Amino acid sequence: SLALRLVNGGDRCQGRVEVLYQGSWGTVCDDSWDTNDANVVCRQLGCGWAMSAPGNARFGQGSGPIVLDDVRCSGHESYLWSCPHNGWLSHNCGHSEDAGVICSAVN
Ligand SMILES: [Mg+2]
């Protein structure tokens, strides 16, 4: 029912995090975004371990929905949406804060 991708990284294993929610791709706010969250993304995609969890539109800004904020993974989960989060749809954040990952399998 949900899906996850990275965009604008020049490689499938780094880029801006996007989640398909209710049929539309949205971004993730960087307010609580850390390497625990990035490790979950990298594992879910088959991309190894997280080298970094860059914020502030490191891979550009999205232009539509912002679907998650305040994501707080322990780091061991198998899907980003399985981590604790404050519901769906960010009412707090703008696209200046869109979150990214860089995974070890980048090549
Ligand atoms: Mg977090």
Author numbering: 990 to 1096
Paper quotes:
The salivary scavenger and agglutinin (SALSA), also known as gp340, “deleted in malignant brain tumors 1” (DMBT1) and salivary agglutinin (SAG), is a multifunctional molecule found in high abundance on human mucosal surfaces. SALSA has widespread functions in innate immunity, inflammation, epithelial homeostasis, and tumour suppression. The first 13 SRCRs are 109 aa domains found as “pearls on a string” separated by SRCR-interspersed domains (SIDs). The SALSA SRCR domains reveal a classic globular SRCR-fold, with four conserved disulphide bridges, as described for the SRCR type B domains.
The domains were purified by Ni-chelate and size-exclusion chromatography (SEC) and crystallised, and the structures were solved by molecular replacement. This yielded the structures of SRCR1 and SRCR8 at 1.77 and 1.29 Å, respectively. The fold contains one α-helix and one additional single helical turn. The N and C termini come together in a four-stranded β-sheet. Combined, the data from SRCR1 and SRCR8 are thus valid representations of all SALSA SRCR domains. Both SRCR1 and SRCR8 are stabilized by a metal ion buried in the globular fold. The placement suggests the ion is bound during the folding of the domain and is modelled as Mg2+, which is present in the original expression medium and in the crystallisation conditions of SRCR1. Structural inspection of the overlay of SALSA SRCR8 with the corresponding region in the other known SRCR domain structures clearly shows the potential for cation binding at these sites.
